[PDB]
Design a protein around this nucleic acid. Structure first.
Length: 92
DNA sequence: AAACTATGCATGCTCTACTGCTTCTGATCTAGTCGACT
C-alpha cells in the first residue's frame, strides 16, 4: 500500500512546472513544501493501522534529484539515442 | 466381301531439364556508448 501508487505522475510534473515558472525562491519553496505536506498527511492517513512501514518520500525524491540516483544503472540512452527512438516510434 | 490388325495423326496431361529476371537472405562494413589504459 505504498503512497506512490496513489499519486499520479501528472501532479508531480505540475508541481515541478510551477516551481520552474516561479521566479522568486519563496514561491518555489512554498510549492515544494505544500506538495511534501500533502504527501506526509496522506502517508499518515494511509498507515494508521500498520506498525512497521518502509514507505517514504524516496519514490518522488529520486525523480526530483536524478543526479543522486545510484540504485539504477546507466540507462544507456543519451540525447541522440532518445531522438532516434522518438523518431522511430512516432513514425514521423 | 467382311472383320481384324498395322500404321499414322491430333490433343490433353505430366516429368524433366534448361535459361533468364526479380527478390530475399547471408555476409562485409561505419556511427553511438561504455569501458580500459596512459
Amino acid at each position: 500500500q505504498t503512497v506512490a501508487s496513489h499519486v499520479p505522475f501528472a501532479d508531480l510534473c505540475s508541481t515541478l512546472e510551477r516551481i520552474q515558472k516561479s521566479k522568486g525562491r519563496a514561491e518555489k519553496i512554498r510549492h515544494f513544501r505544500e506538495f511534501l505536506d500533502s504527501w506526509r498527511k496522506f502517508h499518515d492517513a494511509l498507515h494508521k493501522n500498520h506498525k512497521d512501514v518502509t514507505d517514504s518520500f524516496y519514490p518522488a525524491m529520486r525523480l526530483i534529484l536524478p543526479q543522486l540516483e545510484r540504485e539504477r544503472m546507466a540507462y544507456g540512452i543519451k540525447e541522440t539515442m532518445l531522438a532516434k527512438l522518438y523518431i522511430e516510434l512516432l513514425n514521423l
